[PDB]
Design a protein around this ligand. Sequence first.
Ligand SMILES: Nc1ncnc2c1ncn2[C@@H]1O[C@H](COP(=O)(O)OP(=O)(O)CP(=O)(O)O)[C@@H](O)[C@H]1O
Ligand SMILES: [Mg+2]
Lengths: 268, 377, 390
Amino acid sequence: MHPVQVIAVTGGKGGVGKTNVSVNLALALADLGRRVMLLDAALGLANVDVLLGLTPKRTLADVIEGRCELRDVLLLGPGGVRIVPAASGTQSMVHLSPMQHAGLIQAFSDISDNLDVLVVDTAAGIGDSVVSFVRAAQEVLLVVCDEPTSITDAYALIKLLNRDHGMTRFRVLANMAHSPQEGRNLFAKLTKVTDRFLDVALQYVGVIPYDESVRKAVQKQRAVYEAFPRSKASLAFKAVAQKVDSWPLPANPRGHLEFFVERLVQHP
Amino acid sequence: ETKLLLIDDNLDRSRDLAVILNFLGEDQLTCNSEDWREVAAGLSNSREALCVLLGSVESKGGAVELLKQLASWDEYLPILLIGEPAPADWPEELRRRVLASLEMPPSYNKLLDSLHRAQVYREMYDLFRSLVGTSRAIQQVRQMMQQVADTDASVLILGESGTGKEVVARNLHYHSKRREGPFVPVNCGAIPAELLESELFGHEKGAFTGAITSRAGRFELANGGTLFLDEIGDMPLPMQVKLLRVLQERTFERVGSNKTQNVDVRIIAATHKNLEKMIEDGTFREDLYYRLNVFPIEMAPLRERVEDIALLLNELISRMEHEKRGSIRFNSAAIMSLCRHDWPGNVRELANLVERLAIMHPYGVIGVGELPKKFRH
Amino acid sequence: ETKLLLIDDNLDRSRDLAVILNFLGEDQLTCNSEDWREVAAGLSNSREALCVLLGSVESKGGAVELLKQLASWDEYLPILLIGEPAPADWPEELRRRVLASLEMPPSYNKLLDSLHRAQVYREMYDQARERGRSREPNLFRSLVGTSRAIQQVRQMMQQVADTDASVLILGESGTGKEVVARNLHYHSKRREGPFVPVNCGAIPAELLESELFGHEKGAFTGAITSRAGRFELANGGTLFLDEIGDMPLPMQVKLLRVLQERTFERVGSNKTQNVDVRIIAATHKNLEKMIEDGTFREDLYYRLNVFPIEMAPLRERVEDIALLLNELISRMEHEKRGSIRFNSAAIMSLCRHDWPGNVRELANLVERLAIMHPYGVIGVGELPKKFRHV
Ligand SMILES: Nc1ncnc2c1ncn2[C@@H]1O[C@H](COP(=O)(O)OP(=O)(O)CP(=O)(O)O)[C@@H](O)[C@H]1O
Ligand SMILES: [Mg+2]
């Protein structure tokens, strides 16, 4: 028994590689030796199963519609990572009430085997589902690219969270950067904007290089960590995962709704 | 707790006072001028003697010498005469300890005014590590916590935003009989109004359009411990009514269920809003207010405890040694500049500033220009 | 001018009680079980005998003959037992003429509370000369004071106690209307009937119909059971409507129908039910001003205000604070929850306070001071800053 670390991968801007970061970070953390569960919070449109080549028989639409419980929709994905699949264009998953998000987050407490890693792949945008899944996670990892639109969207998400929920600690990961100096400069620009308007704490995690092996892996419907384990992107993901494993574990519950409050209450 | 010494060789008046103090609920030991040393030897220390009630003395030398060896016994031990007029020729050196001159039979009013004055002079003459500081406000808070932590009572922590109410609540819980129980925090301003009832009480398999499983609420999570309701002022009125009903009856029901469950929890509520004005405007319930206000603890803003900032800085840096995100040190000019700040959101901004400069410049030293903005002027 | 009678055959107990009463500054005539009449004749008339403190009896006969002889001396003379629990050897109707049993040695607060209880007994049951029925004490528990307002409240409660009529209690929030309702209920013809309190402001406005009148199967979404309302639970008893002023107009019409026609309807039901209940309404709003504001029913107001009890704020009866502190502290001692003592300065400072939420504020402050300063003397310095005054 131990507290479970929950990582929300977000960034607001679409097409920045949130799903790739989620999947590859999950496989890398499983490689270091943790029991990892990956949740596809893109509830209306599923991409984790597409990138990993999985064809789930039961998805979360079956859980919400009540045909099955939450345990029997788990899939054993690559590297031992257990996947919670989402629906793809199901009318009962396009938009859910905050009560339904609360119920789904609370129902995850039935799982008591993962080794303090639960990676949550939020959808694009700053909508209600994204905010609900980010606020429920201990760590918030923002994937940003070196474009004005991505910086603006990340700043908007940070400003929303800080203004309306008081969040102040954010992790930033650069993706599709053509040089380490590009990632450093991107972090510098994001921090410049945030310091100019806000008072929040941004921590640089690392950089994932632009690598065409990722594109080949997506075309093959497999993960770049397992399809091309010796590529630059795979090594960057391994380094980031080593950095992520060194993050401090949660110790005290907060007042709002969050994943696995049971383990955060009884253990201390 | 504290004993009283009555020194009188007049047995009739000695018995008179002895029954009076016994009636008045005051602990005392009967003494005379020749056996009081043995009684004094029976005392644990000089502190346990609140005062001495001096009466007629027949020992050699008189009352003047008698005060001498009590003075040698203790200089801080006050003296009051029983059934003797105020002196007019006794030495002046001893008149800083004659608090009052009572007459037999004594009166209820002046006896307690005499006893109150004795407590004041004794106070004048002479372990919450998480809360650090040296201001009068912080030690008053620590004393109030010491007084309330050992009893089962509803505590309400009043102050401003980011003043450190959760720390006070945790210290109260850890120094109580419920130390081995859980600590369940509930923030009413971080949960939507429609979710608060389901979060506090729980729900069954089907209670609403999103309930997909049966789970325990935070009252059941706090069974055998304390439930810390932060930001109680923004709780909706219907939820206020239901919370009052649960607190009164000691029983609650899950949403969508008809089974009554009992939970024994300690309520520690926190507020930054002026509740009394909210009852005046009808946005808060007065009955719930007086159920939660059995013991209020008022925290003081950091701008009113400015001499304490350096100790807070050292404490905050200290805890980062345990939660492993680095370390950082400060300069005297930087500390003085921080002390000269308004600080709205006192401890929250102090911790945010420390975390921000720790992640920004790790293992560094902070000068006046090292501060980011609006902190030096 | 008023005097007590201490009748006890133990010389030491007589002496130390006597000196205690002299310490409190209370007049007394010490007596025994054989010569009390000889010294009792010195006083003018039986009225100045406030009460008798009777201890142990080791003389000829039992305590019954002494009780009868004392009753012959004056029928309205309260008796206080000192260090002797009441014996279970008299009829239940003949076991209730004493007011309190004081543990030896008596506590200051409990002694003063018992003396005030005797004074309340004497000031109304003696001079009445009207009640041919056997006297019923204990009807005034939380009503302690020497103000004009509290005596008027006591007179109204005595008027209404023997009559089954609808009562309207007017007073600010926190004055203690529930205890007055309970005192009226338990000392009327409803003593064996249920007492059902309902706070209109607590139930949501959309559920007040179902809560007050009940509902049957499938009355509304969520009605899985046929829960019966408060009025039927109060059948043969009393229903206490608190803050009736926020109850909406259709509910007011149905309440007047219950009051006059004695009929009401459940939710989802097509039959009329008859219940015999007594309605004691409580509010803190000016009902007249609501009538000219078009919010309260005028006919309902006339129907209810036939026996009004106006409970004054504590800020208008400040000289009763000492007695209220004695009652609160006495209960707190009886429940083994500690004790506190004030000096004159603290009491005067409290008397100069505005007191919003009068008696609940007083009790909350007493509990807070018990937690803060247990077994110590409370002065102005040890009171909270909002209570300090110059
Ligand atoms: N470092 C990198 N190098 C090369 N291609 C990369 C890359 N990171 C992401 N991509 C490409 O970006 C595209 C989208 O990736 P992904 O699906 O993970 O993004 P995303 O999940 O943010 C979109 P949405 O939020 O709309 O679901 C894919 O073509 C992927 O291969
Ligand atoms: Mg995606």
